[PDB]
């Protein structure tokens, strides 16, 4: 039977300071016991000073980042180039994820 | 496009009347007269067939009087084809109610739903209304014997005695004159026939130009019987009251 | 007859132009924008003295930071308000923030041209949408059944609009206080109204950053009416 | 599906189908609503060109929407049944989700919304009906009377009338109803309602229907004799 | 694109007439005469075969049609409209009756279904009424023999005998003088041929006349044996030769 | 789920229904009323799947109340029971069936007779002098088969019912936290507060 | 008078749109003819190519509907091709559904039924075409069945269609009065084609070159059209007698 | 009357006036032509230079369907694009099911039936273009011309637009003078000449020439635009003939 | 006359009057200008107010980072069409990782407008658009008409009195086409172009709207004090 999920490994980490924030992630990508790539970035600048990573199943991870990046673009189009605040981004990403509640994005997301 | 050829069947006149409903009523006023009279021990339905030919098969014929269930019948005035569409819907509706509640449908509930269907054709869908007026005669254990009428507008009202179709104005005046509340079925039979005989556009009222029916509790104990009169029985009842 | 979405030879939509005539028959509504807030006022215009005037609802809340006044076929406004409220609340659900006043107005105006052979005709009502947001501050918008909206420093709609608008042209300046704006709406409403203006046949409201959208009591407006009459007599 | 835009604007800014629906209301039998200090009374004219009627079974002019709210109307009878049915269904739906019966304002707002929808939907004509909706909010003793019309506008009234010759009875109510002092009792309210109909009706026989609604689902319809006593009493005071 | 005609094309005029139905009946009046006579032990339906060209083979055009083994139909008016009605009538006898009860519908009920189809063409969106009047003859166990007329409105009436189309007024009068309640099937065929000769102008033989009967069961026309309860169709189309035999003793 | 019982006597129908609502290893409530008044002289008790029970009960309640307002008339107990049966008979072949068992106790004002109907989630209706749903019947029926007379008074019915609750409290594995008892007669529906 | 624009009845019970569709039939100014032999069915039609810039091989009003059925059209080419594509699809579906080749008369009825619908339904116009179907049916033998915009259809001993149809019709009538039979008593299809052209020449009063005609022939198990040289071969045979 | 107010209505003549009115829109458009040759087809069109501000070579009017068919049209340009979009859908589905690229006669009927369908109902408008199209398939070269009615035929040469009669006369001379056949490279040159000659009927604004071709030998059976040296050579040939 | 009731009807001379009436709405609109060099493309638009109390109706809309347009006519129709362009540009990016060619953008708008001119019930769009963009083949300017006709140009203008700017640009063609690598000068030429369409009114700070896209410049719009430089 076809299994729509896979595991691409890797790990990510976010820390916040007083006037800054970091989002780190290793660049290794895997399936089973094989290395797919030694440098495949999974931390992305999404605009409006928001960095994002969706780690786990890379196909779902890329799909989510792609959709959120697109969400930022349309937020500008629909609300007079207003900057998307980090709290508003967070709430928006919840709806992106919960929209697939019964066929989930297999990822742990950090912004 | 097709806008050009739309009659707009569901619009108001500047006076706030529905053109198509008014014109359907005008059509019905040329149909054969039908009379319903409600007595204390039953109901009479009497109707005049539209100008008959001598080669028409009279016994195996049905034009005016139709059975909806064992307790409810209707007299028709208007387009027969239109009436049969509605009659079949009414018959089904009665059975739906019986299937749901295990009780025979109350007369008003059946009348309301049939009248609601007529209403719809006057408010939406762009179709012509049904050119039909009904006299409903029936019995249930809540109100007993009941007479109703409905018309193309989908408006219905209850009656002690009523006429539809041709010469209703003259027929209603005659019924209003001789009707009284303590009346019996056999008296109502006579009134119905006498009224048709005076309002008819024919030369003389004969058995072959009539349909007749009674709804009595004249079965055996606390139950209702529908009697759709046979030709010979109409011939006899016409002699018994001395019309022929 | 003819198509509902037909253009005239002058390049205008018949039905949209005709709905604008319906709005001219409507009761007067006025809005003035200041740096201290936006004021919205309307003429109630009861058709009969037996009608309980406080049930006439022509000023309406959309959200805490956005209010609305109407003029024309006011029954048509119900679904517009329903949409506006849903749009405002939905945006808060999706983005954990207040929706911009301009974005709200644009959303309402998207309904406008959704008619043809969608609904069967345009709306027969014009809206004055007033609110505050952090980006552009206090704002007043005039939303038409054409689907067009203009931002205004001040604006009148309805039967007494062209006379009231000319008056607003002279009176408005960029330093008006909220109190000055309240009195100015009352003054101009009293000028264009048929019956004599009082607390029962006219209604005031405002939106401020601090307290949000508020419809004034009949007691509060009555005192502003009294303050207005005294000031006009005082020179 | 039939799509035609039947309700549209004319050059002068009128929607004629809505305005012609008002003419149907003007043709309908007169209906009046008067609210007292502790009650609302709904009075209705019944035309007398129909003798041989069966009043047991004939549809009544005032309809219960719930045990605490009633609806009367003027205009097309068939049209009114559709509004009444929808209102009754919404009444039960409200009880189901909110766990509380409808307010009279809410029920009125719903009925008015339905009417409005039929003025800008394709393939439908407006309702040829104006309604008077009266009752009491749950756990409230303040009387409520509202009026709706084909356009969809609704409003609250201390007293109001609709239907044929309604302008005559409105005239009567406008000088005979004091806002500062509404009819203090049931008797006073019924009498003022019967008086107002007697300006227009004819005979006070089987031509007038009266329904009294009091707080906490207390609705009753008066019989012929009960109404006839008001008719008899009013005429004797008139000869003066 | 798509059928934008979702509205009625037949509507009431101020006088109460349904114009399109009246005009459909006018088309029936222009149509060639057809008739039906009911005997004690059968029914006969007949019509003239109006040939469009002598190069046309009028055998390939059947005006009298079998609907069920015990029911037949003939018409006056527009031929194409009749043809599709026969298709629909044959199907509805199966879908709404035989597939449910395992037997063919009685005449009155099949007639009722055809009438419904014709009524709907009078009310539904974007269609004109059917321009035909039908005469349907048939037999069934509990009603015996019967004859029905169906009009463009959807109305139907039972007849002892009648005619429709071109010379229907004269033909009906002829049938009134000759019809009694003791007519045997052969006597009814004789009267049918006499009545039709009045309305026919040109050739009057078995090739220009179309005639069918509803009578006794025909085991020879069943096509199989072995089931005692199945005894064959009561509908039979008379051959060209069978008509000429009766035209000599006329 | 749990104990719903019904007894029809000479002049009334008595319904007893357990008060416990248990989820997992916790009794979340001990005063739950597992009943809805459908009309002034018709009461329905219910039992089955969580959520389904109340959702079905209130849905039926809304429909009967709608009918009452429309016709200005109260449906007979027989008519209400047939409506309920059909709704369950529909449900059993749906995508997700209502898993609810009901008893309907009513007083027919036209016949002047009490009536008790037992209907399970499949839509299986019977009229009975006494009824039960679930494991309850396995205990109480032999007790009712013995002590029940068709001419009993309401008081005799309540004592007969006490005997059933006592047997259930003795032999049943679970604590159902007692019962709420309601009586349906010519005067309508009332609750016994001290049981 | 909108009763003349759509297919509803006029006061005299007529359908003007159907009647006007009949007049569109002659818009091409082409005459067609069909006859039956013992073994075959021959159809012939005029071929007029006025423009010198036209590719004459693409100008045709005869269609191969199926392997066994041929169809000639009288009417404008757009409507003609519309009818042809539908007939081809209908014949193909019949074979798939019922396991045998669609008979000529059954296809004629089906296309006639479709035409009938356009006379009753408002949104669809009638096609301004008359369709003549030909075959050698495995049950009925040589067959000619013809359809018109009214939805009428019938079988024919022989037939003709076009502006000068009446002249050809009576010419054929007079031959069958003389011969006393239903067909051309001839063995080969070649001579039945020769008969068809001969009697068309007599009726129309015109001579034909190889490019003035178009010929379709139906035999058992195939219908085929003739090339210019096949017709030329046929024209030579007539001239040498 | 009123017979001309609604599409699909027959007049008492048996005509569809709405289609005849669409033909008027075609006659108003610029001239386009098609020349059938030895092993292919050539298409050319007149592009009126309305202003200096039009970017030369950058408002392309000839369109390719699949990889082997070319289409050009006169009249309402948007209507032509709609027809080509459908043509591309029809060609794609044919190639999908049957593998082989759509034959030209097959493709011709696909457009024909689609255009004919827009004469059947009053809820659609007829196409305001006559389309000249063609290419090379397994049976050689084919040239077609399709009209608003849905009528189409095969052509040796075809012309439509404001200068159709001038172009037709010039086409007829080529057919008479070359019974054996015209070569692809020759047909390109002739196309240029004919467009320049047909421009006399539209001579207020000067124009821009656009040519395309499909040839079994010259373009390998694929549709290509004529550009650069071959275009300028064809322009010069045309310039020499008008003087 | 009798042939202007809907878009589905041709006139006897082959005209579509509903489409022509839609074209008329553009002529009533405020003037907007478009022009380009080889490196940049510039839109200039005169904005219109209701009165002195109202804002000035925005004429320019961004479609992507490399594309955008200006409008003249029915503004809601421009919103519908610009939204469609935003989606089409977006589809090209998400599915093909490809910036939508300005030429394809024109073809897509043509086909969307066309469908509204051949079916019953619908109406033509009542707006004209000037689309500018920078893609893989350099700078571009397009003119959209709601008849469906889209045209690529060096420069143009639409709206009331657009003929003045259109004549000026026709004269200035050889000059402004070679303003490469100089944004402010290409704008100056566009501002001088739109000045040939002014009557009684002059370009003020809340009246003028300028947009620019090019080689090293994303599509950006200038309003308010940012256009004071050019008056
Ligand atoms: Cl068929
Ligand atoms: Mg038609």
From Swiss-Prot, chain A:
Keyword Chloroplast included in the entry's annotation: no
Keyword terms: Cytoplasm, Nucleus, Proteasome
Chief place of localization: cytoplasm
GO CC terms, sorted: cytosol; nucleus; proteasome complex; proteasome core complex, beta-subunit complex
GO biological process: proteasomal ubiquitin-independent protein catabolic process; proteasome-mediated ubiquitin-dependent protein catabolic process
Location of this chain's protein in the cell: Cytoplasm; Nucleus
Signal peptide: none
Quaternary structure and partners: The 26S proteasome consists of a 20S proteasome core and two 19S regulatory subunits. The 20S proteasome core is composed of 28 subunits that are arranged in four stacked rings, resulting in a barrel-shaped structure. The two end rings are each formed by seven alpha subunits, and the two central rings are each formed by seven beta subunits. The catalytic chamber with the active sites is on the inside of the barrel.
The family this protein is said to belong to: Belongs to the peptidase T1B family.
Function: Non-catalytic component of the proteasome which degrades poly-ubiquitinated proteins in the cytoplasm and in the nucleus. It is essential for the regulated turnover of proteins and for the removal of misfolded proteins. The proteasome is a multicatalytic proteinase complex that is characterized by its ability to cleave peptides with Arg, Phe, Tyr, Leu, and Glu adjacent to the leaving group at neutral or slightly basic pH. It has an ATP-dependent proteolytic activity.
Protein name, per record: Proteasome subunit beta type-6
Gene that encodes the chain: PRE7
Curated annotation (Swiss-Prot), chain D:
Compartments where found: Cytoplasm; Nucleus
Positions where Phosphothreonine occurs in the chain: 58
GO biological process, one term: proteasomal ubiquitin-independent protein catabolic process
Keywords from the named record: Cytoplasm, Nucleus, Phosphoprotein, Proteasome
Cellular component annotations (GO), alphabetically ordered: mitochondrion; nuclear outer membrane-endoplasmic reticulum membrane network; nucleus; proteasome complex; proteasome core complex, alpha-subunit complex; proteasome storage granule
Domain of life: Eukaryota
Assembly notes: The 26S proteasome consists of a 20S proteasome core and two 19S regulatory subunits. The 20S proteasome core is composed of 28 subunits that are arranged in four stacked rings, resulting in a barrel-shaped structure. The two end rings are each formed by seven alpha subunits, and the two central rings are each formed by seven beta subunits. The catalytic chamber with the active sites is on the inside of the barrel. Interacts with CIC1.
Role: The proteasome degrades poly-ubiquitinated proteins in the cytoplasm and in the nucleus. It is essential for the regulated turnover of proteins and for the removal of misfolded proteins. The proteasome is a multicatalytic proteinase complex that is characterized by its ability to cleave peptides with Arg, Phe, Tyr, Leu, and Glu adjacent to the leaving group at neutral or slightly basic pH. It has an ATP-dependent proteolytic activity.
Family statement: Belongs to the peptidase T1A family.
Curated annotation (Swiss-Prot), chain H:
An example Gene Ontology molecular-function term: mRNA binding
Record-level GO cellular component terms: nucleus; proteasome complex; proteasome core complex, alpha-subunit complex; proteasome storage granule
TM helices/strands, residue ranges: none
Keywords (A to Z) from UniProt: Acetylation, Cytoplasm, Nucleus, Proteasome
Entry similarity comment: Belongs to the peptidase T1A family.
Purpose of the protein: The proteasome degrades poly-ubiquitinated proteins in the cytoplasm and in the nucleus. It is essential for the regulated turnover of proteins and for the removal of misfolded proteins. The proteasome is a multicatalytic proteinase complex that is characterized by its ability to cleave peptides with Arg, Phe, Tyr, Leu, and Glu adjacent to the leaving group at neutral or slightly basic pH. It has an ATP-dependent proteolytic activity.
Quaternary structure and partners: The 26S proteasome consists of a 20S proteasome core and two 19S regulatory subunits. The 20S proteasome core is composed of 28 subunits that are arranged in four stacked rings, resulting in a barrel-shaped structure. The two end rings are each formed by seven alpha subunits, and the two central rings are each formed by seven beta subunits. The catalytic chamber with the active sites is on the inside of the barrel.
Record lineage: Eukaryota, Fungi, Dikarya, Ascomycota, Saccharomycotina
Alphabetical GO biological process terms: proteasomal ubiquitin-independent protein catabolic process; proteasome-mediated ubiquitin-dependent protein catabolic process
Main location group: cytoplasm
UniProt keyword Repeat, yes or no: no
Curated annotation (Swiss-Prot), chain I:
Residue positions, PTM Phosphoserine: 11
TM segment ranges: none
GO biological process, one term: proteasomal ubiquitin-independent protein catabolic process
SMART domains: Proteasome_A_N
Domain of life: Eukaryota
Covalent link location (Glycyl lysine isopeptide (Lys-Gly) (interchain with G-Cter in ubiquitin)): 188
PROSITE patterns cross-referenced by the UniProt entry: PROTEASOME_ALPHA_1, PROTEASOME_ALPHA_2
Pfam families the record matches: Proteasome, Proteasome_A_N
Keyword Amino-acid biosynthesis: no
Assigned keywords, A-Z: Cytoplasm, Isopeptide bond, Nucleus, Phosphoprotein, Proteasome, Ubl conjugation
GO terms for cellular component: nucleus; proteasome complex; proteasome core complex, alpha-subunit complex; proteasome storage granule
Location(s) in or outside the cell: Cytoplasm; Nucleus
InterPro entries, alphabetized: Ntn_hydrolases_N (IPR029055), Proteasome_alpha (IPR050115), Proteasome_alpha-type (IPR023332), Proteasome_asu_N (IPR000426), Proteasome_sua/b (IPR001353)
Note: Present with 7210 molecules/cell in log phase SD medium.
Assembly behavior: The 26S proteasome consists of a 20S proteasome core and two 19S regulatory subunits. The 20S proteasome core is composed of 28 subunits that are arranged in four stacked rings, resulting in a barrel-shaped structure. The two end rings are each formed by seven alpha subunits, and the two central rings are each formed by seven beta subunits. The catalytic chamber with the active sites is on the inside of the barrel.
Family: Belongs to the peptidase T1A family.
PANTHER family associated with the record: PROTEASOME SUBUNIT ALPHA/BETA
Name used for this protein in its record: Proteasome subunit alpha type-6
Gene from which this protein is expressed: PRE5
């Amino acid at each position: 039977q076809f299994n729509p999920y896979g595991d691409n490994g890797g790990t990510i980490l976010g820390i916040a300071g007083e006037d800054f924030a970091v989002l780190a992630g290793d660049t290794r990508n895997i399936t089973d016991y094989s290395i797919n790539s030694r440098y495949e970035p999974k931390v992305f600048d999404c605009g409006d000073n928001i960095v994002m990573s969706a780690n786990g199943f890379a196909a779902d991870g890329d799909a989510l980042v792609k959709r959120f990046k697109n969400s930022v673009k349309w937020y500008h189009f629909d609300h007079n180039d207003k900057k998307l605040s980090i709290n508003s981004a967070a709430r928006n990403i919840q709806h992106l994820l919960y929209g697939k509640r019964f066929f989930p994005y297999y990822v742990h997301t950090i912004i | 496009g097709s806008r050009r050829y739309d009659s707009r069947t569901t619009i108001f006149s500047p006076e706030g009347r529905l053109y198509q409903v008014e014109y359907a009523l005008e059509s019905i006023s040329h149909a054969g007269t039908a009379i319903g009279i409600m007595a204390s021990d039953g109901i009479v339905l009497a109707a005049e067939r539209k100008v008959t030919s001598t080669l028409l098969e009279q016994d195996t014929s049905t034009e005016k009087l139709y059975k909806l269930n064992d307790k409810i019948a209707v007299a028709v005035a208007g387009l027969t084809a239109d009436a049969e569409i509605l009659i079949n819907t009414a018959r089904i509706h009665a059975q739906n109610y019986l299937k749901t509640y295990n009780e025979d449908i109350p007369v008003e509930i059946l009348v309301r739903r049939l009248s609601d269907i007529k209403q719809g054709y006057t408010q939406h869908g762009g179709l012509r209304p049904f050119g039909v007026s009904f006299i409903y005669a029936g019995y249930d254990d809540r109100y007993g014997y009941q007479l109703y009428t409905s018309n193309p507008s989908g408006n219905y009202t209850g009656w002690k005695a009523i006429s539809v179709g041709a010469n209703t104005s003259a027929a209603q005046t005659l019924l209003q004159m001789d009707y009284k509340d303590d009346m019996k079925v056999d008296d109502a039979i006579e009134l119905a026939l006498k009224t048709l005989s005076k309002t008819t556009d024919s030369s003389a009222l004969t058995y072959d130009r009539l349909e007749f029916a009674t709804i009595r509790k004249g079965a055996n104990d606390g139950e209702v019987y529908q009697k759709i009169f046979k030709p010979q029985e109409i011939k006899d009842i016409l002699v018994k009251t001395g019309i022929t | 007859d003819r198509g509902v979405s037909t253009f005239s030879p002058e390049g205008r939509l018949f039905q949209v132009e005709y709905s604008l005539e319906a709005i001219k028959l409507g009761s007067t509504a006025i809005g003035i924008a200041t740096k201290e807030g936006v004021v919205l006022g309307v003429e109630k215009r009861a058709t009969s003295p037996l009608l309980e005037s406080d049930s006439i609802e022509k000023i309406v809340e959309i959200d805490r930071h956005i209010g609305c006044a109407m003029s024309g076929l006011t029954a048509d406004a119900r679904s517009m308000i329903e949409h506006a409220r849903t749009a405002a609340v939905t945006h808060n659900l999706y983005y954990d923030e207040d929706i911009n006043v301009e974005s709200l107005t644009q959303s309402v105006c998207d309904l406008a041209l959704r008619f043809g052979e969608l609904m069967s005709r345009p709306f027969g009502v014009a809206l004055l949408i007033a609110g505050h947001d952090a980006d552009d501050g206090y704002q007043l918008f005039h939303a038409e059944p054409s689907g067009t909206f203009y931002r205004y420093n001040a604006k009148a709609i309805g039967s007494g609009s062209e006379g009231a608008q000319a008056e607003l042209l002279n009176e408005w300046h960029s330093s008006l206080t909220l109190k000055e704006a309240e009195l100015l709406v009352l003054k101009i409403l009293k000028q264009v109204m048929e019956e004599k203006l009082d607390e029962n046949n006219a209604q005031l409201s405002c939106i401020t950053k601090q307290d949000g959208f508020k419809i004034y009591d009949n007691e509060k407006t009555a005192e502003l009416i009294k303050e207005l009459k005294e000031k006009e007599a005082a020179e | 599906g039939y799509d035609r835009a039947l309700s549209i604007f004319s050059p002068d800014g009128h929607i004629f189908q809505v305005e012609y629906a008002l003419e149907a209301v003007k043709r309908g039998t007169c209906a009046v609503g008067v609210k007292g200090k502790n009650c609302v009374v709904l009075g209705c004219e019944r035309r007398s060109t129909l003798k041989l009627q069966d009043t047991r079974i004939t549809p009544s002019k005032v309809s219960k929407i719930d045990s605490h709210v009633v609806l009367s109307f003027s205009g097309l009878n068939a049209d009114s049944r559709i509004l009444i049915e929808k209102a009754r269904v919404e009444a039960q739906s409200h009880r189901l989700t909110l766990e509380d019966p409808v307010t009279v304002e809410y029920l009125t707002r719903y009925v008015a919304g339905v009417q409005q929808r039929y003025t800008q939907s394709g393939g439908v004509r407006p309702f040829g009906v104006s309604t008077l909706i009266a009752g009491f909010d749950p756990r409230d003793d303040e009387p409520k009377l509202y009026q709706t019309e084909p356009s969809g506008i609704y409003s609250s009234w201390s007293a109001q009338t609709i239907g044929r010759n309604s302008k005559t009875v409105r005239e009567f109510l406008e000088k005979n109803y004091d806002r500062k002092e509404p009819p203090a009792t049931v008797e006073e309210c019924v009498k003022l309602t019967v008086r107002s109909l007697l300006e227009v009706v004819q005979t006070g026989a089987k031509n007038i229907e009266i329904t009294v609604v009091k707080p906490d689902s207390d609705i009753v319809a008066l019989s012929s004799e009960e109404i006839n006593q008001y008719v008899t009493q009013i005429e004797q005071e008139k000869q003066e | 694109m798509t059928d934008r005609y979702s509205f009625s094309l037949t509507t009431f005029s101020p006088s109460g007439k349904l114009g399109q139905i009246d005009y459909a009946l006018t088309a029936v009046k222009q149509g060639v005469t057809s008739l039906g006579i009911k005997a004690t032990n059968g029914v006969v339906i007949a019509t003239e075969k109006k040939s469009s060209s002598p190069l046309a083979m009028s055998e390939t055009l059947s005006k009298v049609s079998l609907l069920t083994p015990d029911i037949g139909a003939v018409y006056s008016g527009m031929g194409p409209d009749y043809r599709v009605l026969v298709d629909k009538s044959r199907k509805v006898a199966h879908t709404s009756y035989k597939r449910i009860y395992g037997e063919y519908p009685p005449t009155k009920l099949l007639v009722s279904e055809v009438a419904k189809i014709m009524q709907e063409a009078t009310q539904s969106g974007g269609v004109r009424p059917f321009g035909v009047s039908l005469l349907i003859a048939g037999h069934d166990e509990f009603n015996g023999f019967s004859l029905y007329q169906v009009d463009p409105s959807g109305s139907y009436f039972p007849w002892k005998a009648t005619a429709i189309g071109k010379g229907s007024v004269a033909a009906k009068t002829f049938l009134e003088k000759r019809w009694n309640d003791e007519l045997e099937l052969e006597d009814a065929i004789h009267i049918a041929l006499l009545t039709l000769k009045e309305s026919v102008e040109g050739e009057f033989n078995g090739d220009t006349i179309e005639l069918a009967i509803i009578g006794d069961e025909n085991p020879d026309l069943l096509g199989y044996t072995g089931i005692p309860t199945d005894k064959g169709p009561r509908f039979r189309k008379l051959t060209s030769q069978e008509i000429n035999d009766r035209l000599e003793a006329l | 789920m749990d104990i719903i019982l019904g007894i029809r006597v000479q002049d009334s129908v008595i319904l007893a229904s357990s008060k416990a609502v248990t989820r997992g290893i916790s009794v979340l409530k001990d005063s739950d009323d597992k009943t809805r008044q459908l009309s002034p002289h018709t009461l329905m008790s219910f039992a089955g799947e969580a959520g389904d029970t109340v959702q079905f009960a209130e849905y039926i309640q809304a429909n009967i109340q709608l009918y009452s307002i429309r016709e200005d008339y109260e449906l007979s107990p027989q008519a209400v029971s047939s409506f309920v049966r059909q709704e369950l008979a529909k449900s059993i072949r749906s995508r997700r069936p209502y898993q609810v068992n009901v008893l309907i106790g009513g007083y027919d004002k036209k016949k002047n007779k009490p009536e008790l109907y037992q209907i399970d989630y499949l839509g299986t209706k019977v009229e009975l002098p006494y009824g039960a749903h679930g494991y309850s019947g396995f205990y109480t029926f032999s007790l009712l088969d013995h002590h029940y007379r068709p001419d009993m008074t309401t008081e005799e019915g309540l004592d007969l019912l006490k005997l059933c609750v006592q047997e259930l409290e003795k032999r049943m594995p679970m604590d159902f936290k007692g019962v709420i008892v309601k009586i349906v007669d010519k005067d309508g529906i009332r609750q016994v507060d001290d049981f | 008078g909108y009763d003349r624009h759509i297919t509803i009845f006029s006061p005299e019970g007529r359908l003007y749109q159907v009647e006007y569709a009949f007049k569109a039939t002659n818009q091409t100014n082409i005459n067609s003819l069909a006859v039956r032999g013992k073994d075959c069915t021959v159809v012939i039609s005029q071929k007029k190519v006025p423009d010198k810039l036209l590719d004459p091989t693409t100008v045709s009003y005869i269609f191969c509907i199926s392997r066994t059925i041929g169809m000639v059209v009288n009417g404008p080419i757009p409507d003609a091709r519309n009818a042809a594509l539908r007939a081809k699809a209908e014949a193909a579906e019949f074979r798939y559904k019922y396991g045998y080749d669609m008979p000529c008369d059954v296809l004629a009825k089906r296309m006639a039924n479709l035409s009938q619908i356009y006379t009753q339904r408002a949104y669809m116009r009638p096609l301004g075409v008359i369709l003549t179907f030909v075959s050698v049916d495995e049950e009925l033998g040589p067959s000619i069945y013809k359809t018109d915009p009214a939805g009428y259809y019938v079988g024919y001993k022989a037939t003709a269609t076009g502006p000068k149809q009446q002249e050809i019709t009576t010419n054929l009538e007079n031959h069958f009065k003389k011969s006393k039979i239903d067909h051309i008593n001839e063995e080969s299809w070649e001579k039945v084609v020769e008969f068809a052209i001969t009697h068309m020449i007599d009726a129309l009063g015109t001579e034909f070159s190889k490019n003035d005609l178009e010929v379709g022939v139906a035999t058992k198990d195939k219908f085929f059209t003739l090339s210019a040289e096949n017709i030329e071969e046929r024209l030579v045979a007539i001239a040498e007698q | 009357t009123g017979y001309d107010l609604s599409n699909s209505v027959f007049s008492p003549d048996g005509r569809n006036f709405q289609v005849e009115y669409a033909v008027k829109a075609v006659e108003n458009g610029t001239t386009s032509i098609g020349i059938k040759c030895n092993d292919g087809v050539v298409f050319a069109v007149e592009k009126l230079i309305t202003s200096k501000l039009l970017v030369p070579q950058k408002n392309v009017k000839i369109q390719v369907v699949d990889r082997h068919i070319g289409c050009v049209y006169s009249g309402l340009i948007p209507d032509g694009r709609h027809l080509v979009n459908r043509g591309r859908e029809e060609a794609a589905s044919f190639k999908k099911l049957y593998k082989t690229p759509i034959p030209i006669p097959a493709f011709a009927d696909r457009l024909g039936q689609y255009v004919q369908a827009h004469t059947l109902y009053n809820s659609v408008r007829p196409f305001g273009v006559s389309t000249i199209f063609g290419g090379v398939d397994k049976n050689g070269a084919h040239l077609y011309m399709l009209e608003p009615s849905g009528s189409y035929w095969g052509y040796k040469g075809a012309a439509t637009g404001k200068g159709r009669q001038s172009a037709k006369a010039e086409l007829e001379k080529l057919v008479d003078h070359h019974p054996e056949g015209l070569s692809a490279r020759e047909a390109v040159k002739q196309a240029a000449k004919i467009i320049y000659l047909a421009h006399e009927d539209n001579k207020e604004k000067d124009f821009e020439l656009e040519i395309s071709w499909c040839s079994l030998s010259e373009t390998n059976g694929l549709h290509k635009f004529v550009k650069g040296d071959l275009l300028q050579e064809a322009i010069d040939f045309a310039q020499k003939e008008i003087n | 006359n009798n042939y202007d009731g809907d878009t589905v009807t041709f006139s006897p001379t082959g005209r579509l009057f509903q489409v022509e009436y839609a074209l008329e709405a553009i002529k009533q609109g405020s003037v907007t200008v478009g022009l380009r060099s080889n490196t940049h493309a510039v839109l200039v638009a005169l904005k219109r107010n209701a009165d002195e109390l109202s804002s000035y109706q925005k004429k320019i809309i961004k479609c992507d980072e490399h594309m955008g347009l200006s409008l003249a006519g029915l503004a809601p129709d421009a919103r519908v069409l610009s939204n469609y362009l935003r989606q089409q540009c977006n589809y090209s990016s998400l599915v093909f990782n490809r910036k939508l060619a300005v030429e394809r953008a024109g073809h897509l708008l043509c086909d969307k407008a066309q469908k509204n001119t051949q079916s019953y019930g619908g109406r033509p769009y009542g707006v004209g658009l000037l689309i500018i963009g920078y893609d893989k083949s350099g700078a571009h300017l397009l003119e959209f008409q709601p008849s469906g006709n889209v045209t690529e140009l060096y420069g143009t203008a639409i709206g009331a009195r657009s003929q003045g700017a259109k004549t000026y640009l026709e004269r200035t063609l050889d000059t402004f086409i070679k303003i490469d690598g100089n944004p402010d000068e290409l704008i100056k030429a566009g501002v001088e172009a739109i000045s040939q369409s002014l009557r009684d009114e002059s370009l003020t700070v809340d009246n003028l709207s300028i947009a620019i896209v090019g080689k090293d410049t994303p599509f950006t719009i200038y309003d308010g004090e940012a256009v004071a430089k050019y008056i």
